[PDB]
Design a protein around this ligand. Structure first.
Ligand SMILES: *[C@H](C)[C@H]1/C(=C/c2[nH]c(/C=C3N=C(/C=C4\NC(=O)C(CC)=C4C)C(C)=C\3CCC(=O)O)c(CCC(=O)O)c2C)NC(=O)[C@@H]1C
Ligand SMILES: *[C@H](C)[C@H]1/C(=C/c2[nH]c(/C=C3N=C(/C=C4\NC(=O)C(CC)=C4C)C(C)=C\3CCC(=O)O)c(CCC(=O)O)c2C)NC(=O)[C@@H]1C
Ligand SMILES: *[C@H](C)[C@H]1/C(=C/c2[nH]c(/C=C3N=C(/C=C4\NC(=O)C(CC)=C4C)C(C)=C\3CCC(=O)O)c(CCC(=O)O)c2C)NC(=O)[C@@H]1C
Ligand SMILES: *[C@H](C)[C@H]1/C(=C/c2[nH]c(/C=C3N=C(/C=C4\NC(=O)C(CC)=C4C)C(C)=C\3CCC(=O)O)c(CCC(=O)O)c2C)NC(=O)[C@@H]1C
Ligand SMILES: *[C@H](C)[C@H]1/C(=C/c2[nH]c(/C=C3N=C(/C=C4\NC(=O)C(CC)=C4C)C(C)=C\3CCC(=O)O)c(CCC(=O)O)c2C)NC(=O)[C@@H]1C
Ligand SMILES: *[C@H](C)[C@H]1/C(=C/c2[nH]c(/C=C3N=C(/C=C4\NC(=O)C(CC)=C4C)C(C)=C\3CCC(=O)O)c(CCC(=O)O)c2C)NC(=O)[C@@H]1C
Ligand SMILES: *[C@H](C)[C@H]1/C(=C/c2[nH]c(/C=C3N=C(/C=C4\NC(=O)C(CC)=C4C)C(C)=C\3CCC(=O)O)c(CCC(=O)O)c2C)NC(=O)[C@@H]1C
Ligand SMILES: *[C@H](C)[C@H]1/C(=C/c2[nH]c(/C=C3N=C(/C=C4\NC(=O)C(CC)=C4C)C(C)=C\3CCC(=O)O)c(CCC(=O)O)c2C)NC(=O)[C@@H]1C
Ligand SMILES: *[C@H](C)[C@H]1/C(=C/c2[nH]c(/C=C3N=C(/C=C4\NC(=O)C(CC)=C4C)C(C)=C\3CCC(=O)O)c(CCC(=O)O)c2C)NC(=O)[C@@H]1C
Lengths: 218, 160, 161, 67, 161, 160, 160, 161, 161, 160
């Protein structure tokens, strides 16, 4: 249970093993699969409808940011393509880090290299995830598997299903390190299916506990 | 609702509502009388709308109400008219809200799965909504009919 | 999230009912309040930074909270706290526009108390800062929209204590 | 770091998308050298048509000083 | 993208002057024709599906394009071609409602020819289909709106040319 | 403009402009003359607006025109008033276009960065625009004043 | 076409085919002869299958071949029979390949959109393919009838 | 990627043709060859590492490709070359299983030539090493399946050369 | 990128030789320059924002470039320009501190001139502003350190020019 | 080198370099004399270092020179001693750099796969570099021995 963070907008909040001890060990073998609740139409859950992966959830799920419109300079002022691209950049920051950064923290080179068509949205979020700021905020201060779990939620928009995903990312962490774990998550097939080269990741699934936290209040 | 749509867009953008969105909300709230009048008209004459549209549907698609048809018999036909009533009520929700979201969330997400399970022909459900749209448009001014037609068409297209 | 219109529609739909006289009366009242809500929200969007600034200066500055050892001490923690105040003000404005507190429960108050308890963020000081925001907003936007904004800011406070 | 500048055309099988998809279809992008093998495989196995690959940043025959 | 209003503002700001009388006249020009633009947009919005249907009927069907070996042959190809024509109709509606073809350059022609050449989509037959769409739209909307839509559809064709 | 903004909002969901958007564009086109005159009122009295507002600002913020300030001396006072005139021009563009975008895309994207490089305090630029707003509002009717105040307040909000 | 699926699934992990997959491929290869016999039975009797299925459809759905229908007229009936023959050809492709993959890739991706643009009732095409299945199953043993019915019913499940 | 079966299906489909006698003969030929195809693919799976270890020694080691200045001198390049040859073996095996080089066009020869040109990898030497792998595979697979694997490896080489 | 140390290492490894007499000599020269290199790096880092600020003030401001029509007009164009100059200073300082310019190729001049041609940023005013930057820098560090900074900033300018 | 990695780490955070990095650049530049002293000592004494290391390795690992070993015989012994000389080259390259990067770019990034494709036991190569270490650590002064031992130990750890 300690490896489940709060499903809040931003922050990696885990129960601390020693502070108000609450540990609830359970024997999950290597093959269990965690039941997740889709943020959208229930029938679009990829368990029952694996080809639904990437189907945008509409009003039942989160807002989805896409670089659908053209990028500026793909001279003249009042070019309308400046608001959409910047809204997407700030959305990507809010997705990878949970919230917007303070002044001076944004990866400006990556932003211009994205706004100039030199990279894709996927490449930019990879740069954000591999940034030293992400390492300091979300990788370094945590148990390795807590860091991986929070990473998975931010990048794939869902908690991990079980020991298969967890073990592969954890093994990469053992062998290669943080950048390689980020690479594995963003280069995985499911990322490509759910998010192309032009979609900012978003919350796609919740645990029962997170949904209950959100929807059980008076 | 338009208010919910604008708030969701702003929240996902981590900003306050833009002046355009605030002006859209103003235009929606100040035009509330027309929407509520359209809803009143649809609610008051719901029985005749459903009855006439059901008769037109049955005459146009006799198979669904004849032996072997999904709606054959008294009970199944009554259930068919009840489904039509459900959708007219949902359309009232949509016209009052100024937004098709209540209709979509209450009666169109997974509708094909449900009607395929039941064996109902979805094309006929769409045609029944078409009949109800025609009958309802008959009972109000052209402006009001044009207003409610967008929601009727949303429902029809989601089944077509 | 639900606004006032969607709340009415949900109660009706859960009954399976068409909208009767009382539901239409609720819708009419909300439509009547819409212009006031929009004016107030425009004012708050205009003066959000000032509202937060004045609430902080009123409630938090020149106290142990900002001095070494307090939770607002250090520029990082200062920035995090004023960011949180901006979040609360933005969500209170959302709620006032919608006429429904539901967005607060689904988006803000879910797990917030556990968050602040795990972080060691003092809750009473945060509540005082939010109440200072309420007073500043009341003095800026009026006494009617001030009262509605107060309802939703007090809702945020109720979910934190 | 070595950076390729890959141009590719990605067709759409299994789905007739109605949103704007031209940006995903024929694209030119900078790829780090280390990710180019994986990316080449991903574009190919997706059905893509990699028109062009160049060494935008870096030199051939470099034994040291590549990062 | 751009429209007539943005066009005049851009000219003024690049020059560096407040809007002068001539700019106001050029604005009034777009203002006066607004009714026709909105009307044509709404009509074509109502009839877009039928416009595409009629245009494909009299431009592509029963030819080597829809037969085996033609790039409309399979179901996927036919539906994709209908999707492309839907794009052309709605983007020409977008441009007509604004008075400028900047959006046509932004979100339609930005790499279109490379995509067709790589996927083998024909240019002659898609140009013919676009011109058939022009004929059908001109019949439906009227004379002036038909001419404007035809100008923007010609823009798309020439971009494909 | 409102038409361009509506076009992008419609294309974001890959559809046609809704009847609500089209009707809002209709209302904007028909009410065109009122804003085509509000822009003229702001333009014709531009020097009065800028200079009266600048005097009111230097009474509000005497530090900037004082030695060590960003604007001290006749030269820098004149260039600060130059910026005031620029932003009034953008506000006139905004009232004409019906949208806050050309203001944003000309004078508020990276404004903090540029003025950081130059040393200007930004709260004081917001105050300059606010004084311009007050002086302009005093020159016109209440409803016209509110219509222009929407955009003046947008500029104020994007500055402080 | 389990060879293609097995190779694609093996290329996912960049590995070779495991002994189970290779045994599956070999068993599929052996079944090839029976699959070819079924395919040739459907192919040789293509004309009668299509003719009888079309005749049966035109009695269950007489509206289509009467004035105002889609397939009305010798030309349009000819195109309708041509569509039925196309889908029979795809079914033969499926039985030989052992998979519905060619059927999807040629006939069922965007079929709803195609026929809706053409105005063809999709349920009527589904009934026509069901009649083709009935006739064809009238010429095959139980095993072969079930084997071809897999593909016929998949076409029916995607067409409507 | 398409197999021989799907290749024949597409050949008949582009003509809108049923599977004629020649197509049936091609399908029967592939079904007959399936036994030896699967046998060879099983034998290669247990010797791919050995095959590459022997082919590289036969064709690459102790020459100006692995000495200072040759494009294998650094361990990075040696391991990368081993990876390229590993993938060559496995993809030739896939193509042999499918009885069609279509996959070798999609997942092997899609931008490979321009990737090697950008890095100065000698096309001559990689062609020679692929030929060496073909020779080695011939000894552990047999004669006819040897011809199959040689055809597919030669197809790759002609794609590069 | 390569430093002088890595440059000689790369040459020796390409020719497959130990550190030779000339290699020792060139390493020694870098070691003899690596005191003014670090001092200049520290001084440049201390007051880089002022370097760019004064350069822009004396070389770009209050001319047609910043006026309506020039390519610096707009709060956004100005921001883009100042960050471009700031990046130029950072990467030129890296280049100076390493005794090489491969970093300038691999992290600045990766398609910069083509981008400016596409986007219309002048190729003369950029070099003029960089002249101002190198002037202020050299006047801020010294004759030889300034000579190195001017050499590398001219390398950037030539890559642009 | 240490300079290259300082620069790239700085550019990762887009900063001009921090005081500790420049301090280390100063220290390494000034100690270049000692580092080049060690490098020259190893270069001139390379053949003896390799010979003694190989003899003590073979006394430690007499299997690799036995039949079946990767380095069996005299020609393969020559190749193995050549590899020992190559990694001594890389040690001298590293020491003059102040960083391990050249050693990884040339000799360690891919070494495991190379030796497996060769059948060489990479742990025996680790032992060979060890024997090189305990020979070189007596051929030069006490501090120089450790200054080279850093790179010897890095190679050993990266080959373990
Ligand atoms: C039907 C007999 C009863 C019923 C069902 C019902 N379920 C949901 C939603 C979900 N159902 C599941 C269940 C599973 N997902 C899995 O992966 C597995 C393991 C194989 C199971 C059993 C889940 C996870 C959901 C959430 C959405 C999602 O599918 O991801 C609903 C909808 C609830 C809602 O409020 O939308 C319903 C209605 N309800 C009844 O009343 C029946 C008795
Ligand atoms: C002096 C060079 C400049 C200046 C200073 C100034 N600051 C304030 C108020 C505050 N300053 C801080 C700063 C910090 N708190 C921290 O924890 C850290 C790091 C440890 C810093 C740097 C804070 C928190 C405040 C708020 C007051 C409080 O401490 O509780 C003021 C007063 C502002 C007011 O209106 O009260 C002033 C004057 N002002 C200048 O003009 C100089 C350039
Ligand atoms: C300000 C009045 C008080 C205060 C605040 C404070 N908060 C934090 C840190 C965090 N605040 C949050 C809050 C939220 N996350 C959400 O998702 C939501 C809804 C959108 C909220 C409100 C979180 C998660 C954190 C931790 C992560 C992060 O800060 O980014 C701090 C800093 C604590 C620290 O050092 O981590 C502070 C200072 N502190 C006071 O003293 C005031 C009373
Ligand atoms: C018969 C059971 C039903 C019917 C058929 C019908 N179809 C058309 C027209 C077309 N049908 C197709 C379909 C395909 N083309 C292909 O290549 C394939 C994939 C192998 C298919 C399935 C196409 C493309 C057309 C367009 C015409 C053309 O080919 O040029 C018609 C004519 C419609 C008209 O008005 O022109 C008809 C009648 N109609 C029914 O009512 C039956 C349910
Ligand atoms: C129809 C008149 C002709 C025709 C069409 C056809 N198009 C494609 C494939 C694509 N078409 C586009 C075009 C666009 N996508 C966009 O988002 C926009 C900009 C708003 C445009 C203009 C694209 C990008 C593709 C590929 C990606 C995709 O389809 O999703 C095909 C090829 C089908 C295939 O899969 O090979 C076809 C058939 N072909 C004709 O013969 C007609 C003359
Ligand atoms: C006056 C309200 C405040 C103030 C302003 C101030 N600004 C400058 C210098 C410049 N201001 C700009 C701004 C713009 N140029 C544009 O094109 C746009 C879009 C319309 C904007 C907003 C620029 C570019 C400059 C540089 C000089 C030039 O215009 O060529 C100064 C002078 C600074 C100096 O050192 O000379 C001043 C004083 N300063 C205050 O204190 C007021 C609060
Ligand atoms: C000696 C301690 C061990 C040993 C060595 C050994 N190596 C080979 C063959 C090769 N070794 C290399 C070496 C390198 N490749 C690089 O990229 C670098 C980095 C600078 C080095 C050092 C290479 C390239 C080869 C291939 C042959 C060639 O160069 O042409 C052998 C021969 C293997 C065989 O049988 O072919 C041997 C014996 N073997 C041991 O058992 C010791 C532990
Ligand atoms: C080995 C026989 C020869 C050799 C090889 C070599 N290749 C590279 C670099 C790359 N090789 C590939 C591989 C592929 N691209 C494809 O499309 C396919 C289909 C699966 C393959 C196998 C790629 C992608 C690269 C570049 C990117 C990367 O490696 O991730 C090198 C390295 C060159 C360099 O380091 O600059 C080498 C050494 N070189 C020889 O001398 C042999 C004759
Ligand atoms: C300032 C002296 C001049 C000036 C600058 C200017 N540049 C742009 C746009 C871009 N500049 C870059 C910069 C770089 N590309 C690289 O690879 C590197 C290495 C990090 C740099 C520094 C890029 C990528 C762009 C395009 C994308 C982007 O927006 O960043 C502009 C913007 C012009 C416009 O918005 O249309 C400007 C103004 N302009 C002048 O007039 C000066 C002479």
């Amino acid at each position: 249970s300690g490896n489940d963070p709060l499903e809040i907008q931003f922050g990696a909040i885990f129960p601390k093993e020693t502070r108000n001890p609450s540990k609830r060990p359970a024997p999950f073998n290597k093959d269990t699969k965690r039941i997740l609740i889709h943020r959208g139409p229930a029938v679009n859950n990829q368990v029952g409808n694996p080809s639904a992966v990437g189907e945008f959830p509409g009003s039942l799920g989160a807002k989805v940011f896409r670089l659908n419109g053209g990028l500026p300079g793909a001279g003249t002022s009042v070019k309308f393509g400046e608001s959409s691209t910047q809204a997407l950049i700030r959305a990507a920051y809010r997705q990878v880090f949970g919230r917007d950064l303070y002044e001076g923290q944004r990866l400006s080179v990556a932003e211009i290299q994205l706004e100039n068509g030199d990279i894709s949205v996927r490449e930019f979020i990879k740069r954000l995830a591999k940034s030293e700021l992400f390492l300091k905020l979300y990788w370094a201060p945590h148990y390795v598997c807590k860091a991986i779990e929070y990473m998975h939620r931010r990048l794939l928009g869902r908690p991990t299903y079980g020991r298969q995903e967890m073990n592969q990312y954890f093994d990469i962490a053992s062998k290669q390190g943080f950048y390689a774990v980020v690479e594995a998550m963003i280069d995985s097939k499911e990322y490509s299916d759910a998010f192309g080269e032009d979609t900012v990741p978003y919350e796609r699934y919740l645990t029962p506990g997170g949904l209950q936290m959100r929807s059980a209040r008076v | 609702s338009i208010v919910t749509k604008s708030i969701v867009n702003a929240d996902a953008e981590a900003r306050y509502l833009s002046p355009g969105e605030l002006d859209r909300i103003k235009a929606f709230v100040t035009g509330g009388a027309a929407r509520l009048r359209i809803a009143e008209t649809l609610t008051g004459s719901r029985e005749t709308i459903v009855k006439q549209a059901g008769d037109r549907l049955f005459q146009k698609r006799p198979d669904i109400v004849s032996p072997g048809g999904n709606a054959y018999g008294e009970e199944m036909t009554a259930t068919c008219l009840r489904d039509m009533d459900y959708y007219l009520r949902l359309v009232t929700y949509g016209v009052v809200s100024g937004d098709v979201t209540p209709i979509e969330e209450i009666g169109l997400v997974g509708v094909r799965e449900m009607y395929r399970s039941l064996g109902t022909p979805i094309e006929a459900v769409a045609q029944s909504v078409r009949e109800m749209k025609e009958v309802a448009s008959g009972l109000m001014s052209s402006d009001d009919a044009a207003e409610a037609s967008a929601y009727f068409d949303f429902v029809i297209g989601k089944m077509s | 999230m639900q606004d006032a219109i969607t709340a009415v529609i949900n109660s009706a739909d859960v009954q399976g009912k068409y909208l009767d006289g009382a539901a239409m009366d609720k819708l009419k009242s909300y439509f009547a309040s819409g212009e006031l809500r929009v004016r107030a929200a425009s004012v708050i969007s205009a003066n959000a930074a000032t509202i937060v600034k004045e609430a902080v200066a009123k409630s938090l500055l020149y106290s142990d909270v900002t001095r070494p050892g307090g939770n607002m001490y250090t520029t990082r923690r200062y920035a995090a706290c004023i960011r949180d105040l901006d979040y609360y003000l933005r969500y209170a404005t959302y709620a006032m526009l919608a006429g429904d507190a539901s967005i607060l429960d689904e988006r803000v108050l879910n797990g917030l108390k556990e968050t602040y308890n795990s972080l060691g963020v003092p809750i009473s000081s945060t509540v005082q800062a939010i109440q200072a925001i309420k007073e500043v907003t009341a003095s800026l936007v009026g006494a009617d929209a001030g009262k509605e904004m107060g309802v939703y800011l007090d809702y945020i406070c109720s979910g934190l204590s | 770091m070595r950076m390729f500048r890959i141009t590719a055309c990605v067709p759409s099988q299994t789905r007739i998308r109605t949103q704007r998809e031209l940006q995903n279809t024929y694209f030119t992008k900078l790829v780090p050298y280390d990710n180019w093998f994986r990316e080449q495989q991903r574009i190919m196995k997706m059905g893509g048509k990699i028109v062009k690959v160049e060494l935008a940043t870096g030199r051939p025959g470099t034994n040291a000083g590549l990062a």
